[PDB]
Design a protein around this ligand. Structure first.
Ligand SMILES: *[C@@H]1O[C@H](CO[C@@H]2O[C@@H](C)[C@@H](O)[C@@H](O)[C@@H]2O)[C@@H](O[C@@H]2O[C@H](CO)[C@@H](O[C@@H]3O[C@H](CO[C@H]4O[C@H](CO)[C@@H](O)[C@H](O)[C@@H]4O[C@@H]4O[C@H](CO)[C@@H](O[C@@H]5O[C@H](CO)[C@H](O)[C@H](O)[C@H]5O)[C@H](O)[C@H]4NC(C)=O)[C@@H](O)[C@H](O[C@H]4O[C@H](CO)[C@@H](O)[C@H](O)[C@@H]4O[C@@H]4O[C@H](CO)[C@@H](O[C@@H]5O[C@H](CO)[C@H](O)[C@H](O)[C@H]5O)[C@H](O)[C@H]4NC(C)=O)[C@@H]3O)[C@H](O)[C@H]2NC(C)=O)[C@H](O)[C@H]1NC(C)=O
Ligand SMILES: *[C@@H]1O[C@H](CO)[C@@H](O[C@@H]2O[C@H](CO)[C@@H](O[C@@H]3O[C@H](CO[C@H]4O[C@H](CO[C@H]5O[C@H](CO)[C@@H](O)[C@H](O)[C@@H]5O[C@H]5O[C@H](CO)[C@@H](O)[C@H](O)[C@@H]5O)[C@@H](O)[C@H](O[C@H]5O[C@H](CO)[C@@H](O)[C@H](O)[C@@H]5O)[C@@H]4O)[C@@H](O)[C@H](O[C@H]4O[C@H](CO)[C@@H](O)[C@H](O)[C@@H]4O[C@H]4O[C@H](CO)[C@@H](O)[C@H](O)[C@@H]4O[C@H]4O[C@H](CO)[C@@H](O)[C@H](O)[C@@H]4O)[C@@H]3O)[C@H](O)[C@H]2NC(C)=O)[C@H](O)[C@H]1NC(C)=O
Ligand SMILES: *[C@@H]1O[C@H](CO)[C@@H](O[C@@H]2O[C@H](CO)[C@@H](O[C@@H]3O[C@H](CO[C@H]4O[C@H](CO)[C@@H](O)[C@H](O)[C@@H]4O[C@@H]4O[C@H](CO)[C@@H](O)[C@H](O)[C@H]4NC(C)=O)[C@@H](O)[C@H](O[C@H]4O[C@H](CO)[C@@H](O)[C@H](O)[C@@H]4O[C@@H]4O[C@H](CO)[C@@H](O)[C@H](O)[C@H]4NC(C)=O)[C@@H]3O)[C@H](O)[C@H]2NC(C)=O)[C@H](O)[C@H]1NC(C)=O
Ligand SMILES: *[C@@H]1O[C@H](CO)[C@@H](O[C@@H]2O[C@H](CO)[C@@H](O[C@@H]3O[C@H](CO[C@H]4O[C@H](CO[C@H]5O[C@H](CO)[C@@H](O)[C@H](O)[C@@H]5O)[C@@H](O)[C@H](O[C@H]5O[C@H](CO)[C@@H](O)[C@H](O)[C@@H]5O)[C@@H]4O)[C@@H](O)[C@H](O[C@H]4O[C@H](CO)[C@@H](O)[C@H](O)[C@@H]4O)[C@@H]3O)[C@H](O)[C@H]2NC(C)=O)[C@H](O)[C@H]1NC(C)=O
Ligand SMILES: *[C@@H]1O[C@H](CO[C@@H]2O[C@@H](C)[C@@H](O)[C@@H](O)[C@@H]2O)[C@@H](O[C@@H]2O[C@H](CO)[C@@H](O[C@@H]3O[C@H](CO[C@H]4O[C@H](CO)[C@@H](O)[C@H](O)[C@@H]4O)[C@@H](O)[C@H](O[C@H]4O[C@H](CO)[C@@H](O)[C@H](O)[C@@H]4O)[C@@H]3O)[C@H](O)[C@H]2NC(C)=O)[C@H](O)[C@H]1NC(C)=O
Ligand SMILES: *[C@@H]1O[C@H](CO)[C@@H](O[C@@H]2O[C@H](CO)[C@@H](O[C@@H]3O[C@H](CO[C@H]4O[C@H](CO)[C@@H](O)[C@H](O[C@H]5O[C@H](CO)[C@@H](O)[C@H](O)[C@@H]5O)[C@@H]4O)[C@@H](O)[C@H](O)[C@@H]3O)[C@H](O)[C@H]2NC(C)=O)[C@H](O)[C@H]1NC(C)=O
Ligand SMILES: *[C@@H]1O[C@H](CO)[C@@H](O[C@@H]2O[C@H](CO)[C@@H](O[C@@H]3O[C@H](CO)[C@@H](O)[C@H](O)[C@@H]3O)[C@H](O)[C@H]2NC(C)=O)[C@H](O)[C@H]1NC(C)=O
Ligand SMILES: *[C@@H]1O[C@H](CO)[C@@H](O[C@@H]2O[C@H](CO)[C@@H](O)[C@H](O)[C@H]2NC(C)=O)[C@H](O)[C@H]1NC(C)=O
Ligand SMILES: *[C@@H]1O[C@H](CO)[C@@H](O[C@@H]2O[C@H](CO)[C@@H](O)[C@H](O)[C@H]2NC(C)=O)[C@H](O)[C@H]1NC(C)=O
Lengths: 314, 211, 230, 39
C-alpha cells in the first residue's frame, strides 16, 4: 500500500508523478523501513483521509527488476549458419520481399542487426535503395501488416529532460532496490524532435511510390492510431536505461491528393514492463540518474489499412 | 531581519533569503526608510536604464550559484533594507520577497550637532501653553541626549523627547519638548537645553529677558 | 511620462470602510498592469494583488477576500476599498505598476515558463491611522524669531492622528527646510515642529506664511509668522 | 548495532546467506585432471 501525493508544482495542470511514502523492509528481517519514492502514474493504481495507491502488476505477475549492471542497449547482432547450410542475401534494389529474387548472394552471417525493442518505429537499422520500397505479404488484406524501408535515414533526438536521482534501498542481503529520487531543478517532461521539412518531403516521396501500386492519381490521408495497449497505441523503446512511450499524432495529421522549423512529440516513461505480454513474470526498469538523451536514425515503418468505407474514395 | 555591515570602497554581496527551485527569475528589490522601493535586478541579472553597473546579480547557469547581488565600490549611501524576490519554476507565485537584510555602511567621519532653542511664540503664550522645543541636526553618529535645565538644575518634569533619526545627509536629527506652562517657562532666569554629542555638548540657552 | 498620485482619508474608526485612490497620468491605462502594496509599523513588506488589461482582478489569498480593486478607464484613476479595519491595520500604503515577465527555461509549448512580475514604476503614498480616539485639530502658533542666518517657524500641537503637513508662502520657500519628528504624549496626542532657513536681512520685508494642513481633521491654517514686537 | 547490547550477522548488509547442508562435506578429495583424444 502506497501513500502518494500529487507532485509538487504550482497549479496550472488541467501531476502523474507521486511522492509515495510506504512501509518497507530492510536486510535485517525483523526491523523495517519507511521510505519515499517518486513514481510515474502508469506503474501504479489506486485502491478504494488521503488516497492510497498500489502497483499495477500486483494482481497479475511476479515482478522483478533488471539489475542496473545489465543494460537494455540494442547491440548489433549478426545471425550465422553452420556448415552444410548457408544464408542467402537478396540484394536487388527494388524488391517487394515476395516472389523470386533476381539478385542472390550467399553469406554465412547477416549484417549488424541491433535487436531494437521498439514499436511503431524502427531505429538504427538498414536503409533501402533508389525508391522507398513497399513490402507486404498480401496487400489486399488490411489486417496483414505492411513494412517500408527508407533510402534516406531520418534524425530524431529523444530526451528525458528531468534530472533524476536514484535511491538505492537495501532489501537484502544481496538484494536491493533502486528507486527514483526527487527531480533537481526545473520540472520538464520527455519529448523527441523531428525535422518538419525532410518530413514533408518524405511523405511526398512516399506518396509518389504509393501511386505506382494504388491509382495513378488518388487521395491519401494520415490519421492517428485506433486503440490497444499502450505498447501499441504509443511508441515504445529503451532510451539508454529507460523505456519511453510517446504520443504520435501531429506526424499523421495530413490529407494528400496528387499534385523553416521542426516538430516535437510528447513522451512518457514507464518502469514496470511486461513486454511480450507474458504473464506470471513482469520486469522493472531501474531509473537512470539525470537527463537522458539518445539520438536515433529511423530506417523503417509498420502500417495497417482501413476498410471498405466508400468505393474508390480514400 | 538579517543584520549585515560592509566597509567603504570595498565590494559587498547579498545572498537571497530563499533558495532557488527550478530555473529562476530573481527580482532584487531595495528599500530606504520613508522612500519608495527601487528595482535593481530583474530576470536574475537584468538591469534597467539608469542603474549603476556596480550592481550585478546572479545569472542563470542552471542552478549552482544561489541568487546573490554584487556591489563593487561600497559607499556610505548604501545603507538600506534588501529583498530578493525569487520567481522560479517550482515555488511558482511568490507572494513574499523573502527576509530583510538591512545594510549599515560604517566608516564615516564625525560631525557636530547643530542645536537651537526656541521660546514660546507671542501667539502661543496667548494660548496658555508653553512648549520648549530643542532641535538638533547634522551629527554622525546619532547618539544625542536632550536635557532640560531650569536655571542650573535638571528638569525631568514633562520631558517629551523624540528619537534621533537619519536625515537625508546620512546624519541624524532629534527634537525635544519640555511639557510646561507659560508660567514655568518664564519662572527661571535662563532655560538651557543640553544636547550632548560624542562627549561634547552644544547647549542653547533661552532667557526670557533677552529680545 | 507616466506618473502617479495617491489620496488618503487619514483617519478611520475600527471596522469601517477605508478608501484610497491612485491617480494615473502621463500614459494610458491599458498598456500595462497595476498593483498596490502596504506595510505595517514594525513588520515587513506584504504583497496584495494585481489587475490586467482585461480588468480582471487577482488577489493574495491571505486577505480573506476582503479586498476589492477597480480602475477607471476615463478618470485615469485607480481606486481601492477596504472594509472591516482593525487597530493593527494602521499602516502606510503605495501604488505601482507591474511589468509582466515570463521566465522561460524549457519548451514554451509545455508551459515550461512561468509568470514573474517585475515592478518598474512606483508612487508616493499616504498614511492612515485606525484608532478609536476622536480626531484632534492641530494647534498652530507662529513661533517668533529672535534678534541677536536665524530661525522662525510655526508649531503644531495636540493633534490626533497624523499626518499634518506644513508649507511656507504657499510654496514660494524651499531651501533650508528641516522638519522634526512628532513626539507621542502620554495622552495619545502628538506635537510637531518645522523650520526654514533664510538670509539674515529678510525679516519684515518677506511675509512668511506657514500653511498647516491636518487632513484627518481637515484643518488648514494659513497662519503668518512675524518677529517679536521688541 | 547501536539495556543490553544487541547484535546482528555480518553478511546481512552484503550478500544473501545460505548454509551448506550437513550431508555435503568440505573434505578435499584427490582429483586427477584428464585430457581428451587429440590432446
Ligand atoms: C506505516 O505504519 C504505521 C504503523 O506501523 C505499522 O505497524 C507496526 C506494528 C509495525 O509493523 C510497522 O512496521 C508498521 O508499518 C502507520 O501509522 C499508524 O496508522 C494507524 C492507522 O489507523 C493509526 O491508527 C490510529 O490510532 C488512533 C489512536 O490514537 C491515539 O494513539 C495513537 C497511538 O497510541 C497516537 O498515534 C494518536 O496520536 C493518539 O494518541 C494521542 O494523540 C494525541 C494527538 O496527537 C496526543 O495529544 C497530544 O498530547 C501532547 C502532550 O503529550 C500535546 O499536548 C499535543 O498538543 C497533543 O496533541 C495524545 O497525547 C496521544 N495519546 C497517547 C499517545 O497516548 C485511533 O484513534 C485511530 O482510530 C480512529 O479512527 C478509526 C478508523 O480509522 C476508528 O475505528 C477509531 O475508533 C478511531 O476513531 C475514534 O473513535 C473514538 C471512539 O471510539 C472517538 O472518540 C470520541 O471522541 C469524542 C470527541 O470527539 C468524545 O471524547 C468521545 O467520548 C470519544 O469516545 C474519536 O473521536 C474517533 N476519532 C476519529 C478521528 O474518528 C487509528 O486507529 C496509528 O496511530 C498510526 N501510528 C502509529 C501506530 O504509530 C503508517 O500510516 C504506515 N504508513 C503507510 C502504510 O504508508
Ligand atoms: C526540442 O525542441 C524543443 C522546442 O524547440 C526544445 O525546447 C527548447 O528548449 C530550450 C532549452 O534547451 C529552451 O531554451 C530557452 O529559451 C528561453 C527563452 O529564450 C528566448 O527569449 C529570451 C529572453 O529574451 C527576452 O527579451 C527578448 C528580446 O529582448 C524577447 O524576445 C523575449 O520575449 C524576452 O522578453 C523578456 O521581457 C519581456 C517584457 O517584460 C517579457 O514579456 C518576456 O517574458 C521576457 O521576460 C532570449 O534571451 C532568447 O534568446 C536565446 O535564444 C536565441 C535563439 O532562440 C539565441 O539566439 C540567443 O543567443 C539566446 O540563447 C530567446 O529569444 C531562454 O530564456 C532559456 O535560457 C535561460 O534559461 C536556461 C534554462 O534554465 C538557462 O540555462 C539559461 O542560462 C537562460 O537563463 C538566462 O537567460 C534568460 C533569458 O531570458 C534570463 O531570463 C535568465 O535570467 C538568464 O539570463 C542571465 O544570464 C544569461 C547567461 O546565463 C545572460 O545572457 C543574461 O543577460 C542574464 O545575465 C533557454 O534558452 C527553449 O525555449 C525551448 N523551446 C523552444 C521553442 O525553443 C528542446 O530543447 C529540443 N530538444 C532537443 C534535444 O533538440
Ligand atoms: C543534476 O543536476 C545537478 C545540478 O546541475 C548536477 O550536480 C551538480 O554538479 C555540480 C558540479 O558538477 C555542482 O556544482 C558545484 O559543485 C562544487 C563541488 O564539485 C567539485 O568537485 C566535483 C567532483 O565531485 C566536480 O565534479 C565539480 O566540477 C567541482 O570541481 C571543481 O569545479 C570548479 C569549476 O571551475 C573547478 O574550478 C575546480 O578546480 C574543480 N575542482 C576539482 C575538479 O577538484 C561545489 O563546491 C559548488 O558549491 C559551491 O558553489 C555553490 C553555488 O554554485 C554554492 O551554493 C556553495 O556554497 C559552494 O560555494 C563555494 O563555496 C566555497 C567555500 O565556501 C568557495 O570557495 C567557492 O568559491 C564557492 N563557489 C561558488 C560558485 O559560490 C557547486 O555545488 C552542483 O552543486 C551539483 N548539484 C547537485 C544538486 O548535486 C548533477 O550532475 C545532475 N545529474 C546528472 C546525472 O547530470
Ligand atoms: C487522435 O486525435 C484526436 C484529435 O487530436 C484526439 O483527441 C480528441 O480531440 C477532439 C478535438 O476536437 C476532442 O474534442 C471533441 O470536440 C468535438 C467538437 O466540438 C466542437 O464543435 C462543436 C460543434 O461542432 C459542429 O460541427 C461538427 C463538425 O461537423 C459536428 O460534429 C457537430 O455535431 C456540430 O455540428 C461545438 O458544439 C463544441 O463546443 C462549442 O459549443 C460549446 C457549448 O458548450 C461551447 O462551450 C464552445 O465554446 C463551442 O462554441 C466544439 O467547438 C466535440 O463534439 C467532442 O465531444 C463529443 O464527442 C466526444 C467523443 O465522442 C464525447 O466524449 C462528448 O461527450 C461529445 O459527445 C469533443 O469534445 C476529443 O475530446 C478528443 N478525444 C478525447 C478522448 O477526449 C485523440 O485522443 C487522438 N488519439 C490518439 C491515440 O492520439
Ligand atoms: C492539421 O493540424 C492543423 C493544426 O495544427 C496546428 O499546428 C501544429 C504545429 C500544432 O501546434 C497545433 O496545435 C496547431 O493547431 C489543423 O489546422 C487547424 O484547423 C483549425 C480548424 O479545424 C483552425 O482553426 C480555425 O478554423 C476556422 C474555421 O473553422 C470553422 O469551420 C470548421 C469546419 O470547417 C469547424 O469545425 C469549426 O468549428 C469552425 O466553425 C478558421 O476560420 C480559422 O482561420 C482564421 O484564423 C487562422 C489562424 O487561427 C488564420 O490563419 C486564417 O487566415 C483565419 O483568419 C482557423 O483556421 C486552425 O487555425 C488550423 N491551424 C493551422 C495552423 O492552420 C488542420 O486542420 C489539421 N489537418 C487535418 C486534416 O486535420
Ligand atoms: C544513422 O546511423 C547510420 C548507422 O549508424 C548511419 O548510416 C551509415 O553507417 C555506415 C556504417 O554503418 C557509414 O558507412 C561506412 O562506414 C564504414 C565503417 O566505418 C567504421 O569502421 C571504420 C573502419 O573500421 C572506421 O574507420 C570508422 O570510423 C570513422 O567514423 C568514426 C565515427 O563513427 C570516426 O571517429 C573515425 O575517425 C572515422 O571517420 C567506423 O568506425 C566506413 O569504413 C565507410 O567509410 C563508411 O563511412 C555511413 O557513413 C553512415 N551514413 C550514411 C549516410 O550512410 C546514418 O548516416 C545515420 N543517419 C543520420 C541521419 O545520422
Ligand atoms: C490531485 O489530487 C486531486 C484529489 O482530488 C485530484 O482532484 C480531482 O480532480 C478532478 C478533475 O479531474 C475533479 O473532478 C471535477 O469535479 C468538478 C466538480 O464536480 C467537475 O465540474 C469537473 O468536471 C470534474 O469532474 C475532482 O473533484 C478533484 N477532486 C476533488 C476532491 O475535488 C486531482 O485531479 C489530482 N491531480 C492529478 C494530476 O491527478
Ligand atoms: C512481388 O514481386 C513479384 C515480382 O518480382 C510479383 O510477381 C509475381 O511473381 C511470381 C513468380 O513467382 C508469379 O507467379 C506471380 O504471378 C507474379 N505476380 C505479379 C502480380 O506479377 C509478386 O506478385 C509481388 N508480390 C506482391 C505481394 O506484390
Ligand atoms: C539532433 O541533435 C543533434 C545534436 O545532438 C543535432 O545535430 C546538429 O545538426 C546541426 C545541423 O542541423 C549541425 O550544425 C550541428 O553541428 C549538429 N550538432 C551535433 C552535436 O551533431 C541535430 O540537428 C538535431 N536534430 C533535430 C531534428 O533536432
Amino acid at each position: 500500500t502506497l501513500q502518494c501525493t500529487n507532485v509538487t508544482n504550482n497549479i496550472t495542470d488541467d501531476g502523474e508523478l507521486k511522492n509515495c511514502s510506504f512501509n518497507m523492509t530492510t536486510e535485517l528481517r525483523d526491523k523495517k523501513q519507511k521510505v519515499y519514492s517518486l513514481f510515474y502514474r502508469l506503474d501504479v493504481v489506486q485502491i478504494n483521509s488521503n488516497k492510497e495507491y498500489r502497483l499495477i502488476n500486483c494482481n497479475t505477475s511476479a515482478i522483478t527488476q533488471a539489475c542496473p549492471k545489465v543494460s537494455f542497449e540494442p547491440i548489433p547482432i549478426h545471425y550465422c549458419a553452420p556448415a552444410g547450410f548457408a544464408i542467402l542475401k537478396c540484394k536487388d534494389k527494388k524488391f517487394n520481399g515476395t516472389g523470386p529474387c533476381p539478385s542472390v548472394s550467399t553469406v554465412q552471417c547477416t549484417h549488424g542487426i541491433k535487436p531494437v525493442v521498439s514499436t511503431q518505429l524502427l531505429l538504427n537499422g538498414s536503409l533501402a535503395e533508389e525508391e522507398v520500397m513497399i513490402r507486404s505479404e498480401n496487400i489486399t488484406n488490411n489486417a496483414k501488416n505492411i513494412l517500408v524501408q527508407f533510402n534516406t535515414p531520418v534524425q530524431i533526438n529523444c530526451t528525458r529532460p528531468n534530472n533524476n536521482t536514484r535511491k538505492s534501498i537495501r532489501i537484502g542481503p544481496g538484494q536491493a532496490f533502486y528507486a527514483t529520487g526527487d527531480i533537481i531543478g526545473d520540472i520538464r517532461q520527455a519529448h523527441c524532435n523531428v525535422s518538419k521539412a525532410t518530413w514533408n518531403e518524405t511523405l511526398g516521396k512516399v506518396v509518389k511510390q504509393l501511386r505506382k501500386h494504388f491509382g495513378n492519381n488518388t487521395i491519401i490521408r494520415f490519421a492517428n492510431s485506433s486503440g490497444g495497449d499502450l505498447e501499441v497505441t504509443t511508441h515504445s523503446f529503451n532510451c539508454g536505461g529507460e523505456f519511453f512511450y510517446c504520443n504520435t499524432s501531429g506526424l499523421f495529421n495530413s490529407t494528400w491528393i496528387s499534385n523553416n522549423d521542426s516538430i516535437t512529440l510528447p513522451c512518457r516513461i514507464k518502469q514496470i514492463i511486461n513486454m511480450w505480454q507474458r504473464i506470471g513474470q513482469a520486469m522493472y526498469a531501474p531509473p537512470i540518474q539525470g537527463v537522458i538523451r539518445c539520438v536515433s536514425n529511423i530506417t523503417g515503418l509498420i502500417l495497417t489499412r482501413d476498410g471498405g468505407s466508400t468505393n474508390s474514395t480514400t | 531581519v538579517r543584520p549585515l555591515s560592509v566597509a567603504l570602497g570595498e565590494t559587498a554581496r547579498i545572498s537571497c533569503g530563499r533558495q532557488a527551485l527550478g530555473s529562476r527569475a530573481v527580482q532584487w528589490y531595495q528599500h530606504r526608510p520613508g522612500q519608495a522601493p527601487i528595482l535593481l535586478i530583474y530576470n536574475n541579472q537584468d538591469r534597467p536604464s539608469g542603474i549603476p553597473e556596480r550592481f550585478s546579480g546572479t545569472p542563470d547557469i542552471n542552478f549552482g550559484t544561489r541568487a546573490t547581488l554584487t556591489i563593487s565600490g561600497v559607499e556610505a549611501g548604501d545603507e538600506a533594507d534588501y529583498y530578493c524576490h525569487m520567481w522560479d519554476s517550482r515555488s511558482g507565485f511568490s507572494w513574499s520577497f523573502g527576509g530583510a537584510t538591512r545594510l549599515t555602511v560604517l566608516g564615516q567621519p564625525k560631525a557636530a550637532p547643530s542645536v537651537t532653542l526656541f521660546p514660546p511664540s507671542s501667539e502661543e503664550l496667548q494660548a496658555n501653553k508653553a512648549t520648549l522645543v530643542c532641535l538638533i541636526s547634522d551629527f554622525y553618529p546619532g547618539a544625542v541626549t536632550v536635557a532640560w535645565k531650569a536655571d542650573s538644575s535638571p528638569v525631568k518634569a514633562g520631558v517629551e523627547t523624540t528619537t534621533p533619526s537619519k536625515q537625508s545627509n546620512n546624519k541624524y536629527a532629534a527634537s525635544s519638548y519640555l511639557s510646561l506652562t507659560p508660567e514655568q517657562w518664564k519662572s527661571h532666569r535662563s532655560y538651557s537645553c543640553q544636547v550632548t554629542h560624542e562627549g561634547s555638548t552644544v547647549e542653547k540657552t533661552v532667557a526670557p529677558t533677552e529680545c | 511620462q507616466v506618473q502617479l498620485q495617491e489620496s488618503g482619508p487619514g483617519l478611520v474608526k475600527p471596522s469601517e470602510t477605508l478608501s484610497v485612490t491612485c491617480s494615473v497620468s502621463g500614459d494610458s491605462m491599458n498598456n500595462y498592469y497595476w498593483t498596490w502594496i502596504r506595510q505595517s509599523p514594525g513588520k515587513g513588506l506584504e504583497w496584495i494583488g494585481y489587475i490586467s488589461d482585461r480588468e480582471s482582478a487577482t488577489y493574495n489569498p491571505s486577505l480573506n477576500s476582503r479586498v476589492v480593486i477597480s480602475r477607471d478607464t476615463s478618470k485615469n484613476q485607480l481606486s481601492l476599498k477596504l472594509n472591516s479595519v482593525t487597530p493593527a491595520d494602521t499602516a502606510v500604503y503605495y501604488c505601482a505598476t507591474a511589468r509582466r515577465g515570463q521566465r522561460i527555461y524549457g519548451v514554451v509549448s509545455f508551459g515550461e515558463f512561468f509568470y514573474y512580475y517585475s515592478m518598474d514604476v512606483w508612487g508616493k503614498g499616504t498614511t492612515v491611522t485606525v484608532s478609536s480616539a476622536s480626531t484632534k485639530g492641530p494647534s498652530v502658533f507662529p513661533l517668533a524669531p529672535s534678534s541677536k542666518t536665524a530661525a522662525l517657524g510655526c508649531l503644531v500641537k495636540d493633534y490626533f492622528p497624523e499626518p499634518v503637513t506644513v508649507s511656507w508662502n504657499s510654496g514660494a520657500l524651499t531651501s533650508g527646510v528641516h522638519t522634526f519628528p512628532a513626539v507621542l504624549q502620554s495622552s495619545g496626542l502628538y506635537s510637531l515642529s518645522s523650520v526654514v532657513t533664510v538670509p539674515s536681512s529678510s525679516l519684515g520685508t518677506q511675509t512668511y506664511i506657514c500653511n498647516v494642513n491636518h487632513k484627518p481633521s481637515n484643518t488648514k491654517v494659513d497662519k503668518r509668522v512675524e518677529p517679536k514686537s521688541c
